[model samples]
Target: FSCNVDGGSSIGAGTTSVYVNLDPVIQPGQNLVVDLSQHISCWNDYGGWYDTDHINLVQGSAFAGSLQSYKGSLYWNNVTYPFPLTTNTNVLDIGDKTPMPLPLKLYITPVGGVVIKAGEVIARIHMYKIATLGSGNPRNFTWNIISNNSVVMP
Candidate 1:
């Protein structure tokens, strides 16, 4: 699995995108877990890029399982236990004056996780405020995933 960022006009500023890759060949009924965390930082000339936060999980084409939408977070495959939604919607409040980590998770079912047969993909777009961009304090944007999932052969 790998992660990448896009639309970052400058370091610590602008929207960041994340992607994960899963192998197409896998035993049926096997489960996969996805976890991610991010924090806002102010270093070098990137001071203006403050208050980094994630609003929601945008399911990409690579996703093979059903993503359940909750209060302000998401759950995987109708999971009733180990709830996987962010407790607070305000993940990063600028007035706090401290760096906070936002955590996210996703669970994939054996059948639902077989969409990306070879090169399927999924993505999460980061939304934040970049003072340098002169686009105001909050900017809305999005990222896209392109591909299909591969299923294991018996």
Candidate 2:
């Protein structure tokens, strides 16, 4: 799952949140991608806003953890432990499904002055999945986001 926020006063300003649900039990080793991009042409007002800073991923609830700065590339969390990355994507192996609170939170911080030139653009992403397990059903996963203050699209 993915989401985007357009800074403004009406409904675009302020904080934007997203929710993602995933199966709890299933074969380990899966990959998922959550992408966020600047609304340039679509929303001409904030057209020249480029991503200057990097975004961070904050895993909450059951998957409560933090994957900070992975390979200098922001917004990409590759989980390859207990489960391996077979393909060139974010894979997660479901080792144990104990029915815990698996809530994932995404935090985005635009680079200062990284304006998205009238025709330019920027993006943020999150990737994950169940690793490898012998046998089990696909578990469910959920995610959300909380912003600090009103975001301007200028």
Candidate 3:
């Protein structure tokens, strides 16, 4: 587009327009995937030792094994899980290895129809791989949330 004054003494200016095409929304039935890949690391020093060889969720495990409505509790459904989820690691190691690929997945199922607000911290990962050095330093080798393509936003 352009602006013009008189044909003989024309003053011209540039104009522009913008267009966009967006992807479809994440419907209730659709799954929202949060990535746990980027900020994972292992701690194993030649001097350090991890003997207990186990890991547990101090919190956030409740959000798994069942579907939860963000509404009134005590309303019985087909299942009675505090939340919908599952968990695992690739190894139950012999020593000095903190869980590798330190990944956790939260699944939004069809029946569950879970919902979350934008930029909300869905959870925190507080893990301790106990060993001879007492407990892991920075025992909270933590990671961030919702920082990957595993999920789409509104």
Candidate 4:
């Protein structure tokens, strides 16, 4: 919590403590967001720290991987509409459904709706859906990991 970036040698903080609360799978209503410019940041000598290249959020058995927009030259399973803008009113929807070869980590990145800088972003990471279900017939389930709902960015 105390690190002076201007000090050069002030260096990174001791470490960050991460937390997660998730349902088995994110339904249409169960949503989440990971705001890069807001959720993650550091501090300078007295002002503040610059944004890093990596920022991730975790939950349930799923973990959102580091988000690096296309402009940032990354295939980071994320989508930032409006080209690239770090504002509240921009289109910054992102996420993906990846197979957790390690531990079932379908890490999906979801953007946020900043109170200060709004966006066409969603409030939560709604991650799964059923196209159609016929009692005991064929149930076609498809990828649902998305940034479509709003969740108060912590």
Q: Which predicted model would earn the best lDDT?
A: 1
Highest TM-score against the true fold, candidate? 3
Candidates ranked by TM-score, best first?
Answer: 3, 1, 2, 4
Model 2 Cα RMSD, Å?
A: 19.1
Residue 135 Cα positional deviation in candidate 2, in Å, after optimal superposition: 2.1
- Ten-residue region with minimum lDDT total, candidate 4: 95-104
For candidate 2, the 10 contiguous residues with the lowest summed lDDT are 38-47
Please give the distance, in angstroms, between residue 51's alpha carbon in candidate 4 and its true position after superposition.
15
Candidate 3 lDDT over residue span 92-147, tens digit each: 23244332433344344323312443334443333434334454332322322332
In the range 1-154, model 2's lDDT, one tens digit per residue, is: 1123343222212233432222222222322222323221012122232211112232322121232211112232342221111233333222222211122222322332111222211222223322122322222222223222222333
For residues 1-154, could you state the per-residue lDDT of candidate 1 as single tens digits?
0122332233433344444444556565555444433222322222233433223333332332342321122332223223332331233223222332334444555432333444443434333333333443444433333223454534
Q: Which stretches of candidate 2 lie over 4 Å from their true place?
A: 1-74, 78-89, 93-131
Where does candidate 3 have its weakest 10-residue lDDT segment?
A: 1-10
RMSD of each: 8.2, 19.1, 19.3, 19.8
Clash pairs detected, candidate 3:
65-85, 66-83
Is 1 or 4 the stronger prediction by TM-score?
A: 1
**lDDT for each candidate structure:** 0.35, 0.24, 0.31, 0.24
